[PDB]
């Protein structure tokens, strides 16, 4: 298992424009297009992203390309973030994948909002405690099954929630 397989599991794959859990236009493997309520706005962001007139539909290869781009950017956002980097650097390989998953999902910004607490606990290696803290969040309440998988990953350092 690895970050790609993990997120491929959490996000699914849709080749046609769709609304995410928050109701935003997305496509592919969790690729947010726009927060705008306009399908046309979405369609235009998509063409700009793909480099072609898609008409709201892409191929699998196109989806996979956006996905790689997106995993890379998350990794790089973490490494540039003064609050995230140190956390990421203190973790083992499994747990980092868990941190990338959160960032991919909520943005570097969304995650920044956990550092003061859960992230600190992670950095200190208090697995059980961070897991409880992580669960007290809008993130957990809105997307509980996914949050549970991520949280189990941080808790145990294994891929069990994904097998």
**Strand, coil or helix: what is 30?**
coil
Q: How far, CA to CA in Å, does 152 sit from each of 18, 109, 155, 156? A: 28, 22, 5, 6
Cα separation, 120 vs 163, in Å, equals: 28
From the list 137, 94, 93, the residue with the least C-alpha distance to 115 is 137
118 is in an annotated binding site: yes
Contacts with 118 (C-beta within 8 Å, 6 or more apart), sequence order: 130, 133, 134
Phi-psi region of 56 (alpha: psi -120 to 50; beta: other; left: phi over 0): left
Which of 5, 10, 11, 128 is catalytic? The answer is 11
- Bridge partners for 138 per DSSP: none
The answer to whether 137 is annotated as binding is no
110: left (phi over 0), alpha (psi -120 to 50) or beta: alpha
Q: Report angle CA 139, 91, 126 to the nearest 5 degrees.
A: 70
In angstroms, the Cα distances linking 99 to 60, 84, 109, 129 are 26, 9, 13, 16
For 150, the enclosing helix (H) or strand (E) is: helix 144-156
Catalytic residue among 20, 47, 64, 129: 20
Q: Which fold has domain 1-163?
A: Lysozyme (1.10.530)
Q: Is 11 noted as a catalytic residue in this protein?
A: yes
Q: Is residue 76 exposed (0-12), middle (13-18) or buried (19+ Cβ within 10 Å)?
A: exposed
Of the chain, the end-to-end C-alpha distance in Å amounts to 9
Give the method of determination: X-ray
Contact residues for 125 (Cβ-Cβ < 8 A; gap 6+): 90
Residue 38 assigned as binding residue: no
Residue with tokens 């405690």: 129
With a CB cutoff of 8 Å and minimum separation 6, the contacts of 142 are 21
Kindly list the domain boundaries of the chain, sorted by start residue.
1-163
77 touches 108 (CB < 8 A): yes
Rg (CA), the chain: 16
Q: State yes or no: 67 annotated in a binding site.
A: no
- The data reach a resolution, in angstroms, of 2.0
């Amino acid at each position: 298992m690895n970050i790609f397989e993990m997120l491929r599991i959490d996000e699914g794959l849709r080749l046609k424009i769709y609304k995410d859990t928050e109701g935003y236009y997305t496509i592919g493997i969790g690729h947010l297009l726009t927060k705008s309520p306009s399908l046309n706005a979405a369609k235009s962001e998509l063409d700009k992203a793909i480099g072609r007139n898609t008409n709201g539909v892409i191929t699998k290869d196109e989806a996979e390309k956006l996905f790689n781009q997106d995993v890379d950017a998350a990794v790089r956002g973490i490494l540039r973030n003064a609050k995230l980097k140190p956390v990421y650097d203190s973790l083992d390989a499994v747990r980092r994948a868990a941190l990338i998953n959160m960032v991919f999902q909520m943005g570097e910004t969304g995650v920044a909002g956990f550092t003061a607490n859960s992230l600190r606990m992670l950095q200190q290696k208090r697995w059980d405690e961070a897991a409880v803290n992580l669960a007290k969040s809008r993130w957990y309440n809105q997307t509980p099954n996914r949050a549970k998988r991520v949280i189990t990953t941080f808790r145990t350092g294994t891929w069990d929630a994904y097998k």
